[PDB]
């Protein structure tokens, strides 16, 4: 890897500088270099990795949706034939997006998940695995679509099982996992009732545990709880 000659601490330092500069591709490359040093990641480092790749794939996903919408409009009755260019360029963006997802999944498989023994790290990485299979599912149209969807589901489910056993219902990792798995149910698995049930149950159990928290933990948990409520308002 191109980062093999740089010190782990320098890669982490540069990832933080890249974030400040809004250079998310650089941030992700630095964090990939740090993961490939082979040591486990601290909580802060896990969040740098997640933030970096989410910004990268978020730009790709937004671009893919724009291009997919144009492509669908071109395939309506009455639309003039404009050639292969829209499909080709949508495919180019799609292939780049899939490559980033495969890169993240590769880091998780080699070897972040297998070395993650604490609940907070293991749930974090399994949520990430579910997220990046979910992004693959958003663009999948072929023979492997069902297996991609089931890979996301299986990763989310293992993360859910650990989080319910080992974390309080207000834990922000647990809350964000539930938020994302609920969205998976709603828009990937065609299970809006499961999505709504999960979001409501997660919100209500967190509400009942807020009394145990400091002011700063309360702020963290209620922020994600508001996102669950926002989705429930959209869906009902």
């Amino acid at each position: 890897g191109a980062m093999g000659s740089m010190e782990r601490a320098s890669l982490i330092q540069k990832a933080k500088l890249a974030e400040q500069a809004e250079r998310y591709e650089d941030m992700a490359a630095f964090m990939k270099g740090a993961v490939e040093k082979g040591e486990e990641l601290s909580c802060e480092e896990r969040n740098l990795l997640s933030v970096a790749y989410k910004n990268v794939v978020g730009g790709q996903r937004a671009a893919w949706r724009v291009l997919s919408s144009i492509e669908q409009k071109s395939n309506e009755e009455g639309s003039e034939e404009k050639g292969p260019e829209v499909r080709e360029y949508r495919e180019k963006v799609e292939t780049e997006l899939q490559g980033v997802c495969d890169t993240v999944l590769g880091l998780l498989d080699s070897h972040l998940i297998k070395e993650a023994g604490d609940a907070e790290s293991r749930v974090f990485y399994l949520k990430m695995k579910g997220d990046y299979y979910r992004y693959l599912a958003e663009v999948a149209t072929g023979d492997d679509k069902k297996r991609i969807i089931d890979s996301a589901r299986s990763a989310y489910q293992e993360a859910m099982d650990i989080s319910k056993k080992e974390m309080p219902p207000t834990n922000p990792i647990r809350l964000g996992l539930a938020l994302n798995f609920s969205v998976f149910h709603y828009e990937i698995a065609n299970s809006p009732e499961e999505a709504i049930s999960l979001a409501k149950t997660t919100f209500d159990e967190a509400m009942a545990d807020l009394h145990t928290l400091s002011e700063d933990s309360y702020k963290d948990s209620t922020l994600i709880m508001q996102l669950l409520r926002d989705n429930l308002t959209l869906w009902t």
């Binding site: 790749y53 997220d131 990792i173 964000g176 938020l179 963290d220 994600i224 996102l227 926002d230 989705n231």
Partner: peptide
Amino acid sequence: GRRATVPWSH
């Protein structure tokens, strides 16, 4: 308003 998902733990 697009539905919400998160990448971070906190």
